Amino acid sequence: SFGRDACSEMSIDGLCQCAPIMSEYEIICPANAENPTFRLTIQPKDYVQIMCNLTDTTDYQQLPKKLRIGEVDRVQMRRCMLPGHTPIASILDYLGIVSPTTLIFESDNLGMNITRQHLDRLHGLKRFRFTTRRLTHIPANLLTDMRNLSHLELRANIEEMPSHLFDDLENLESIEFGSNKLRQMPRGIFGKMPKLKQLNLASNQLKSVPDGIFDRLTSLQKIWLHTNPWDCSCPRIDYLSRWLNKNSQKEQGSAKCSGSGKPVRSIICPTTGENLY
Ligand SMILES: *[C@@H]1O[C@H](CO[C@@H]2O[C@@H](C)[C@@H](O)[C@@H](O)[C@@H]2O)[C@@H](O)[C@H](O)[C@H]1NC(C)=O
Ligand SMILES: *[C@@H]1O[C@H](CO)[C@@H](O)[C@H](O)[C@H]1NC(C)=O
């Protein structure tokens, strides 16, 4: 495991400078650079922060060599590029990071779209957060085999969500899809969520939801649907207005009608005699 002795030795050969700050260590790569390629913040047996300043994926060869961080709970990556068509776990293995349960990936310099391969060997994760100001495509197989995942956060200006995104994922307790550009929610997306307690869909472009979309959320406790331009015309808002009125205790904040500004829960649609779902 990385400690005092490893930090002192790193400052001797001067490939990367190391300085112990508080109960943590700061690694600058390359040494004495005004704008370093890598700035690592390591707290042994707790967390690792990787601050990147890369122009292209080949800059990863400038990472500290033979570094053995060991077991940590959280890995935070900031401004880092997706390592081409190579898993993110390969960066983690090279730095000697062992079995992290939380991965945070935040970057405006991705260099490419995220794939299923980028998450290979990260099946053990319990918490995953992907953040970017860049418009990104979410493939249908992105979260396949992420069976230990209980907390998912995607803030990547996503417009569409694939229908089979949560296929075979059953341990999910929290889904944070707020502050994206979502115009639609596909029917059957929350069909197999027996443990889901929190769902955030606030600050998107949702005008409607398919009928029966939340009916299988048996463990649901909190839901965010505000800051969406909801179409409160009848019968379009019939299902959501009735559902929000019945589950009023679960709603966090207030979903409002694009026109009037009235809460969605206050709409009572008349009966025309048509078929319901
Ligand atoms: C990111 O993806 C954009 C859209 O990709 C399209 O959709 C996928 C499902 C495939 O069919 C692919 O062949 C299509 O191109 C691209 O337009 C965009 O260039 C990609 N971004 C980068 C940086 O490569
Ligand atoms: C990243 O490096 C460039 C020079 O390549 C520099 O202009 C920029 O300020 C650096 N970013 C930070 C956060 O220091």
Numbering used by the authors: 28 to 304
Authors' account:
endogenous protein Spätzle (Spz) that is unique to insects. related to mammalian growth factors, such as the nerve growth factor (NGF) (Hoffmann et al., 2008; Mizuguchi et al., 1998). segregated in two blocks capped by cysteine-rich regions. dimerization followed by receptor clustering with cell-specific signaling molecules.
in truncating the receptor following the hybrid LRR technology (Kim et al., 2007). technology and referred to as TollN6-VLR (Kim et al., 2007). arc-shape typical of the leucine-rich repeat (LRR) fold. is tethered to the first beta-strand by a disulfide bond (Cys34-Cys45). disulfide bonds stabilize the LRRNT cap in Toll. anchors the fourth strand of the cap to the first leucine-rich repeat (LRR1). five-residue-long beta-strands in LRR1–4 and three-residue-long in LRR5 and LRR6. in the first block of LRRs in Toll to form a hydrophobic spine. C-terminal capping structure (LRRCT) of VLR B.61. to protect the hydrophobic core of the last LRR from solvent exposure.
